[PDB]
Symmetry: C5
Subunit: 24 residues, 5 copies
């Protein structure tokens, strides 16, 4: 459903923010 995709996309955004902190 849509809520599961929202949760997964937020998890991906968290991972991408982690990658941004490492590169900074």
């Amino acid at each position: 459903d849509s809520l599961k995709w929202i949760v997964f996309l937020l998890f991906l955004i968290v991972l991408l923010q982690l990658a941004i902190v490492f590169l900074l």
Copy 2:
């Protein structure tokens, strides 16, 4: 409304990937 939220989150993910790519180089 949920479809719009999913689409906007997907766009945000794409933009975050672009930001990561720009930060790499």
Copy 3:
């Protein structure tokens, strides 16, 4: 309606991500 506010805020976030990408480029 909270869903409309959520969608509008996500759209604003998309625009701000575009601004950040432009600044990084």
Copy 4:
């Protein structure tokens, strides 16, 4: 409820994005 807390967190995210843009500029 959860929706209002989500709206508040998204508003905080927008504020932090604006701060990031200001720091980059």
Copy 5:
């Protein structure tokens, strides 16, 4: 419930934005 996970992930995103701002300044 998925709403609790959404709220927690938004909180994590807020924390990571705070960390990004701290690193930028």
